[PDB]
Design a protein around this ligand. Structure first.
Ligand SMILES: COc1ccc(-c2cc(N)[nH]n2)cc1
Ligand SMILES: COc1ccc(-c2cc(N)[nH]n2)cc1
Lengths: 212, 212
């Protein structure tokens, strides 16, 4: 059993998770509007940065009140950010056995650093990046993290994968590799091992300890 | 002026994209995103999109005949065909900048174990094809990756909407016992810039030593 809470100023962006990645009852996912923890009539969640810079920063006060209500000492607080530790398959396996994830989604130029720092005095906190590109906010990263983690949960139970094929054996004058039709398990395993190592050196040489 | 077509068996998953697009950019004709149900191009009464893998293995493979008809209708010679896959070349910020000046992106979203390799190989004989990964984790299908790519590319198109960045702060100057670093309130802007550079250097050493 896992519970996931997502906090955001754009709750509508999280609807793609509504169609189960939940239907079984293994996991429960809930989405919260950050603005519900404001108190002024304009529901202001942002202010200009100290020390200069472009754009706006999310205020710590509103975030602190939201996390106070949602989190406990058992919670793993997840904060997507381009400046984070890398989120990898290893991370996904680690988080797949957690009881409670809370994902805090930033907008504007980001969240006041004291939010994560205050939270770390009460619970475990992980600032993470899902890849070396920049988004407008954390919501799409939240969807990626939820999908990668939930598929590993017990109950929903290196090198690059090579190419796959299915019927018909000839299509537009292009043939499925004959070894794959041969029924020879040893030869098929060897061919697939070689396609994978060939794809890896071409596309991801870093995975085998080479440059670029 | 960019057109994006997305092809998927789960069209509702791409809901956040159309919802995040400002009317002004659509009205100005800067961007158009369209989502297509792959089952529109199936041949049989059961609307089949998958079949068993040649050479054996777990799961299923998406049929080349269905995908071939879909891409024949949607793509032209000027199309950049994007195929998300864990076995792809890395999608990075430089990729996003490159794709931001394209006239037509088509994103082919896989499910099951992937798409028969002859689909991409045939398409590459008449248009540019890019198989790409958005990070070193595995998803159930390409839809969440399509959301990430669309957001990272379109935020670089005007008006559509090295080292790691250090921490950001805003009001109040003191919160839950934590003060904003006094240098940021000093009015010494050369010193502030040097402080930010050192914060960035330390964060990069701790979280991303690969960047150094
Ligand atoms: C403003 O709030 C955010 C939160 C997260 C991101 C992000 C994370 C990654 N790997 N790319 N972009 C950007 C902005
Ligand atoms: C079966 O269709 C897909 C398509 C893409 C993926 C993917 C891409 C990345 N970076 N992780 N997972 C998985 C399955």
């Amino acid at each position: 059993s896992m519970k996931i809470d997502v906090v955001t100023i754009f709750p509508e962006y999280l609807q793609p998770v509504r169609q189960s990645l939940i239907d079984a009852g293994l996991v429960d996912v809930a989405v919260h509007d950050l603005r519900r923890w404001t108190h002024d009539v304009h529901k202001s969640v942002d202010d200009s940065p100290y020390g200069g810079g472009p754009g706006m920063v999310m205020k710590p006060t509103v975030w602190g009140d939201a996390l106070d209500e949602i989190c406990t000492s058992e919670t793993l607080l997840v904060v997507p950010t381009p400046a984070g530790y890398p989120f990898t398959q290893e991370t996904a396996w680690q988080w797949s056995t957690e009881d409670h994830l809370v994902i805090a989604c930033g907008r504007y130029e980001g969240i006041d650093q004291r939010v994560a720092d205050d939270a770390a005095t009460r619970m475990r906190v992980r600032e993470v990046s899902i890849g070396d590109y920049v988004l407008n906010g954390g919501e799409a990263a939240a969807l990626v993290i939820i999908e990668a983690v939930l598929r590993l949960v017990p109950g929903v139970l290196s090198l690059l994968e090579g190419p796959s094929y299915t019927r018909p054996p000839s299509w537009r004058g292009m043939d499925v590799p004959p070894v794959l039709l041969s029924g020879d398990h040893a030869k098929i395993a060897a061919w697939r091992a070689e396609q994978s190592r060939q794809r890896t050196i071409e596309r991801r040489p870093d995975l085998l300890g080479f440059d670029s």
